[PDB]
Amino acid sequence: VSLMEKLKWKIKCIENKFLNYRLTTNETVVAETEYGKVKGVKRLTVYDDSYYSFEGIPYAQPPVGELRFKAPQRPTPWAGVRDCCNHKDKSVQVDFITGKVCGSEDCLYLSVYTNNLNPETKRPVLVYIHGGGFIIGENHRDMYGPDYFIKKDVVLINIQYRLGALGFLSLNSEDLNVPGNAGLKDQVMALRWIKNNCANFGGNPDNITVFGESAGAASTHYMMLTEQTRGLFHRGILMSGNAICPWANTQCQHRAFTLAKLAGYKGEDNDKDVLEFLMKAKPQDLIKLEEKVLTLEERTNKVMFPFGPTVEPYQTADCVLPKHPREMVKTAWGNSIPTMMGNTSYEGLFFTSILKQMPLLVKELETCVNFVPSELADAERTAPETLEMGAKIKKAHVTGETPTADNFMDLCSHFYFWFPMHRLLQLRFNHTSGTPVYLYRFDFDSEDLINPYRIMRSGRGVKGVSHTDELTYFFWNQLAKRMPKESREYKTIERMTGIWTQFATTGNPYSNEIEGMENVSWDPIEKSDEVYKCLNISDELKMIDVPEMGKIKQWESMFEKHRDLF
């Protein structure tokens, strides 16, 4: 991020401090939890609404010392009142604006918001799992403010979970009890807390919806796949991602050794001696080196992150992912709850700044071998079958005689988002009770209201609807402002939170109380459909055939000889 955007951000951090004070009221309130009483507080919004706020509710023991890299343990209870009028630390990470390491190992918290702690009827409970590649993110209100959703009569809960190597280290040796996925295990313990405790805040434990964007959508989907969570919740919403995405899962068992070596370890490639070294390292020292861990070959093969969700090398009682996601879909409990999925209209537009920076990436489209699904390719990407599959992808995305940045971005929309969604829809239809899945396509562009991922990405002034742009219409953030009621942006806030609340309530996203829906016939996708229908959300709401369908089917065609892998 540029100096000018860094200054502008610092100014916004200070203004947000002042605003937050102005919007804090003096109406403190106490709620019960299974581990002790919590004190929260009423806050106002810039729209002059109000909500009860409890932040910093622990759902697990701080995963420090000997609990580092291990599955979470339940927190210790308390006999008095715990102060929850302020946020806790985020998980250790690199701050994207500043570039410096920030956060704490002491990060296993969730926050609970609602406009009314004693409603006459128990309310639908919406649980947001944040994205950020499993390496960044938080539940702080300067990023994920509940100010729009508290216009609706819901309970909203935003969780944290461990990030990076501290959340996703994985070792083969069973003696060591570091199988992987500690951060997903965190999410499991948070969802158990929510089911056990949401009643204390006016939530219906029999009507919980989990939703997330990007890594939070992959997370939502993992929570729908694992047996650990069977029946814990009742709707899911996957916003630009799922567990079949190529970035959502990695076998990272050798990368602990690599990270240790970067941190100054000398010794053998031996899980015990490697874990021992990493157990004494300063957490910030490990997070700072994480960006250096992937090899050139891995980055070329499109491995996005060194640590993340993984298939666990052995079983334990707390095992979240015992098989590859596609195998887990075959027996998944969550195939049988109402689900909504969708993507933006130009997902890969996110990579604009990356292509400016590294313009030789566009030369990858000359053969497209690097984008062939890894299960079909070779690591060297030189086999003739790999070249033939790459030629198919190239037909789908290269529109003229020389590959362009736009073509690269288009291909990215499909490789990282639309293709895995198609794979997941088709696999799930084979293994479901028949509960509906609905599709949206977010296609609303504005520069009048933005979110911090636009600064991260250097996307100011870039026309089109990038990955992450929909977050602006769900959550308040410190770059936001009060929008006039008549504005296109306000109307889109109303619509998006309306639709999500409607879905959370009923399992059907359609409502004629939502403005612009009077001619919308939003039907779920069927097995028999050759062409997906979606609600395209722009200035109007319109059911259309997914514009991306053609390319989706071209990607599918790479599996003609290997239909069992599709």
Side-chain angles (χ1 to χ4, degrees):
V1 180
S2 69
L3 173 69
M4 290 301 108
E5 297 299 325
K6 287 177 162 163
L7 293 176
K8 283 175 76 144
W9 182 255
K10 188 276 226 53
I11 289 170
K12 308 301 288 212
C13 300
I14 299 152
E15 291 170 358
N16 208 55
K17 193 156 278 167
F18 286 104
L19 179 59
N20 186 71
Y21 181 64
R22 284 180 62 81
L23 277 357
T24 302
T25 77
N26 288 317
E27 288 188 349
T28 55
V29 296
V30 174
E32 296 295 318
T33 82
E34 72 180 286
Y35 301 121
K37 297 167 191 310
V38 294
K39 173 162 65 64
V41 63
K42 182 173 279 176
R43 305 182 171 289
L44 315 188
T45 71
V46 299
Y47 294 105
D48 303 319
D49 302 305
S50 70
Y51 65 103
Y52 298 99
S53 173
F54 298 85
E55 297 174 285
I57 309 186
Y59 66 80
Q61 259 306 97
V64 296
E66 296 290 280
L67 291 176
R68 185 190 283 173
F69 308 121
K70 315 298 186 315
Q73 295 227 261
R74 292 166 59 79
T76 112
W78 53 96
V81 186
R82 178 166 205 119
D83 178 13
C84 291
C85 298
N86 287 297
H87 65 79
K88 288 298 196 168
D89 270 80
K90 58 187 77 190
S91 182
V92 188
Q93 58 195 271
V94 183
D95 179 304
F96 59 93
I97 268 63
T98 67
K100 302 172 324 207
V101 175
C102 67
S104 173
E105 291 185 274
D106 184 356
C107 71
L108 299 185
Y109 300 98
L110 48 85
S111 293
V112 180
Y113 314 111
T114 179
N115 74 31
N116 185 344
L117 280 163
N118 291 280
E120 252 67 48
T121 42
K122 297 297 221 207
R123 276 178 175 189
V125 174
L126 286 67
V127 186
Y128 193 68
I129 312 180
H130 69 80
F134 303 101
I135 63 167
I136 66 175
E138 62 288 297
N139 65 6
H140 297 183
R141 290 183 304 101
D142 56 16
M143 310 301 172
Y144 297 100
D147 305 49
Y148 310 151
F149 271 114
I150 65 82
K151 290 176 160 304
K152 313 298 239 178
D153 287 339
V154 304
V155 177
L156 175 58
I157 303 174
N158 296 69
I159 71 168
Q160 285 182 171
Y161 58 96
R162 283 171 279 178
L163 301 179
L166 290 170
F168 298 94
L169 204 86
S170 176
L171 299 165
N172 291 308
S173 180
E174 180 164 3
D175 296 331
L176 311 180
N177 198 39
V178 185
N181 308 318
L184 292 174
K185 302 174 185 176
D186 290 347
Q187 303 177 6
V188 173
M189 188 167 296
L191 291 187
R192 297 170 169 160
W193 185 97
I194 290 166
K195 172 75 121 141
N196 292 342
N197 296 275
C198 61
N200 301 124
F201 303 84
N204 188 359
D206 293 334
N207 193 30
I208 301 170
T209 297
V210 184
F211 74 120
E213 186 268 354
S214 189
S219 292
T220 296
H221 194 216
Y222 286 121
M223 294 305 105
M224 289 173 84
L225 290 175
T226 188
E227 294 286 328
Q228 294 285 0
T229 54
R230 177 176 292 266
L232 281 182
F233 60 91
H234 307 92
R235 291 92 169 77
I237 309 172
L238 314 180
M239 309 170 69
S240 308
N242 64 63
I244 315 306
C245 297
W247 52 267
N249 199 102
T250 180
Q251 300 309 106
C252 51
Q253 289 63 43
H254 184 55
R255 306 199 185 111
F257 170 74
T258 302
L259 175 60
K261 285 323 260 289
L262 286 155
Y265 176 68
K266 321 262 87 127
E268 310 294 343
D269 176 11
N270 179 84
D271 290 349
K272 189 156 175 281
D273 300 339
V274 173
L275 177 59
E276 289 169 356
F277 172 93
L278 297 162
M279 286 298 282
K280 67 181 63 88
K282 273 216 249 48
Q284 66 266 28
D285 289 353
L286 302 187
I287 299 308
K288 169 199 159 89
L289 294 162
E290 203 170 287
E291 62 152 72
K292 289 167 201 87
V293 168
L294 288 170
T295 70
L296 219 64
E297 177 167 316
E298 284 168 332
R299 290 164 198 277
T300 306
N301 277 82
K302 303 301 183 179
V303 173
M304 203 183 268
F305 309 104
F307 303 93
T310 197
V311 178
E312 307 181 42
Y314 50 89
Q315 260 140 0
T316 61
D318 292 347
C319 184
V320 165
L321 306 183
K323 296 198 147 46
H324 277 85
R326 285 182 64 259
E327 304 305 321
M328 292 179 70
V329 177
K330 299 168 176 195
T331 54
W333 75 267
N335 292 354
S336 303
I337 70 185
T339 301
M340 173 163 61
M341 312 180 184
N343 294 297
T344 74
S345 55
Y346 199 171
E347 292 277 353
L349 189 58
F350 193 90
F351 302 106
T352 298
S353 75
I354 299 182
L355 292 166
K356 261 70 151 287
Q357 191 85 252
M358 232 140 67
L360 270 99
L361 281 175
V362 185
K363 293 208 209 217
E364 291 193 297
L365 277 33
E366 289 171 10
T367 70
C368 295
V369 301
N370 292 339
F371 293 107
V372 170
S374 71
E375 58 271 42
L376 301 186
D378 63 310
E380 252 72 292
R381 303 291 176 142
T382 55
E385 186 150 1
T386 306
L387 279 167
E388 71 198 36
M389 282 169 197
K392 285 184 171 195
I393 297 170
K394 189 180 173 180
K395 283 187 170 85
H397 304 284
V398 174
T399 48
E401 168 146 35
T402 123
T404 66
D406 292 345
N407 296 346
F408 186 100
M409 301 185 281
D410 184 49
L411 190 159
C412 288
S413 306
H414 281 78
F415 183 65
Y416 294 118
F417 303 101
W418 287 104
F419 189 48
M421 175 185 95
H422 175 57
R423 297 175 79 163
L424 167 62
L425 293 161
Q426 290 307 315
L427 235 205
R428 177 201 167 273
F429 279 142
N430 294 345
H431 299 102
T432 176
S433 71
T435 52
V437 53
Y438 297 91
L439 292 184
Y440 71 88
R441 184 168 183 278
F442 185 88
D443 188 27
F444 181 78
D445 193 15
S446 178
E447 201 93 56
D448 281 20
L449 194 70
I450 66 155
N451 76 61
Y453 279 120
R454 186 178 299 239
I455 302 317
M456 184 181 103
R457 85 185 143 95
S458 291
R460 227 190 267 274
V462 172
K463 300 183 173 54
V465 193
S466 172
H467 188 62
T468 74
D469 286 352
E470 82 280 39
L471 293 171
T472 307
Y473 304 97
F474 286 101
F475 298 103
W476 167 273
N477 71 77
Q478 64 173 27
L479 315 182
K481 54 180 193 284
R482 193 193 185 136
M483 297 302 285
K485 221 92 77 66
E486 38 278 302
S487 68
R488 54 200 291 274
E489 298 80 3
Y490 189 88
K491 281 172 196 289
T492 299
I493 294 166
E494 291 188 295
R495 287 166 172 182
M496 295 310 291
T497 57
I499 289 175
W500 265 231
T501 286
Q502 180 53 53
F503 184 69
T505 303
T506 68
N508 182 344
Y510 169 82
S511 168
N512 47 34
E513 309 326 327
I514 299 168
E515 114 77 36
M517 265 175 160
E518 29 283 290
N519 282 321
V520 166
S521 300
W522 199 349
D523 289 321
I525 310 301
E526 299 298 349
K527 194 173 163 170
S528 65
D529 299 350
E530 284 172 52
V531 172
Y532 301 146
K533 285 189 80 212
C534 63
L535 180 70
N536 198 77
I537 300 161
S538 179
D539 288 85
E540 81 217 359
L541 313 175
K542 194 128 292 178
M543 295 296 308
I544 71 182
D545 288 338
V546 165
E548 284 79 15
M549 203 74 210
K551 290 165 190 171
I552 293 171
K553 290 314 289 195
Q554 294 176 72
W555 280 74
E556 173 176 353
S557 78
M558 293 190 274
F559 290 83
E560 289 153 0
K561 293 157 175 209
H562 307 281
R563 286 291 303 175
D564 64 306
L565 306 180
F566 167 60

